[PDB]
Symmetry: D2
Subunit: 114 residues, 4 copies
């Protein structure tokens, strides 16, 4: 199944934050309406924040997260959760190796803001 | 129901990260086994990452998030989600006012790390 | 925070299914647009299905689950989860007593159908 | 990532319930410790409950959901959610065709019971 793709309400600000947990340098690309809107890159085995940004979901509301390590695409796992019918989280884990911890880059998208 | 309380794996590192979306200054406390282990604070209406920290869940694994604004506890909402039977997120929203957006402080706990 | 209230896409059919795990008879009301659209009742300590139906979210998309036992509303917990950006679950637990298992009536809403 | 595999607490009763939404007859097998413990089959485009049963997670706690149509495995998507640190749902969708509604068989596992 496709992972790392989310439909947000149109024309809405959202937060995106990425964390790293791997020996490999993580590259996280965030695409809005199929065009790169943010790219984060860093290396940590201690959950360091490697980027945070506020983006607009645009007319389509389509947001996609991709993760790679030195050009090799990581396998993704994702879901969306909504609390009290108001607070949205789109969550992504990724695996760059063999241990299947899926934390090598972790990406959290949240909306609405403000 | 009780909200903002999670049973983590014992003795395990976790990340805790807080975001602010309110006119009021947020104060987020993270309790491990009922003692304060981290405190974050800030004021943003654009999802500022007012704190992020790596903590250990301790012998009991009990982790609790509390949020206050203007010296008054915020109402909390929370859930935990597990992806691919391994990757965990404990999610908290909080409301300091009347609009019930529940994003005034948002807290994400993630494990495993490394 | 309010629980058991979900905004579905408008005019979209959904499944609703209730399970019982309690000494007491559970009465589950499912509201669409703030009117009762279905009512299920039964008693089980073995997770019996006490009702299942297809309903339409209608023009507002507003769906609410209420649970009563022994003449009083049960305390509710809920969340929505979306898998592969396609499959939606709105999930409700409820507590009629003191043990806080929150399974006394469990309600699962899923969409889309067909 | 692997989907449809969950680790439950050992020696614990859980509910498993399957719904169908497809022109094809769905076959759902629920494995506990790698042995089939329940099987449901049926065709519906109206979210019929093609089966619901109480199982025991046994010594291993390992529960796997498999979905097929006439022996051809469907593609799975899954996650687990925990409400109020107590109430657990393991969720599975499946896709037997090309439209990616992922509702062709939907399986919900819930615990605790009673
Ligand atoms: C230090 C290790 O680095 C890579 O091998 C990751 O895939 C592992 O999960 C671990 O983080
Ligand atoms: C700017 C406003 O500040 C407080 O009133 C919050 O409770 C509102 O949600 C909004 O963020
Ligand atoms: C058999 C018992 O019945 C009621 O007391 C429920 O609140 C309990 O959770 C348990 O199901
Ligand atoms: C009626 C159709 O039957 C199969 O083609 C399913 O894959 C479709 O999702 C739809 O349910
Ligand atoms: Ca890894
Ligand atoms: Ca890792
Ligand atoms: Ca607010
Ligand atoms: Ca706010
Ligand atoms: Ca109870
Ligand atoms: Ca009960
Ligand atoms: Ca399908
Ligand atoms: Ca279908």
């Amino acid at each position: 199944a496709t992972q790392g793709v989310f439909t947000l309400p149109a024309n809405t600000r959202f937060g995106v934050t990425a964390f790293a947990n791997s020996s490999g340098t993580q590259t996280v690309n965030v695409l809005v309406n199929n065009e790169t809107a943010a790219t984060f890159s860093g290396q940590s085995t201690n959950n360091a924040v490697i980027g945070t940004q506020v983006l607009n979901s645009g007319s389509s509301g389509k947001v996609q997260v991709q993760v790679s390590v030195n050009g090799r695409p990581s396998d993704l796992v994702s879901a969306q959760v909504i609390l009290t019918n108001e607070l949205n989280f789109a969550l992504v884990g990724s695996e760059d190796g063999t241990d299947n911890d899926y934390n090598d880059a972790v990406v959290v998208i949240n909306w609405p803001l403000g």
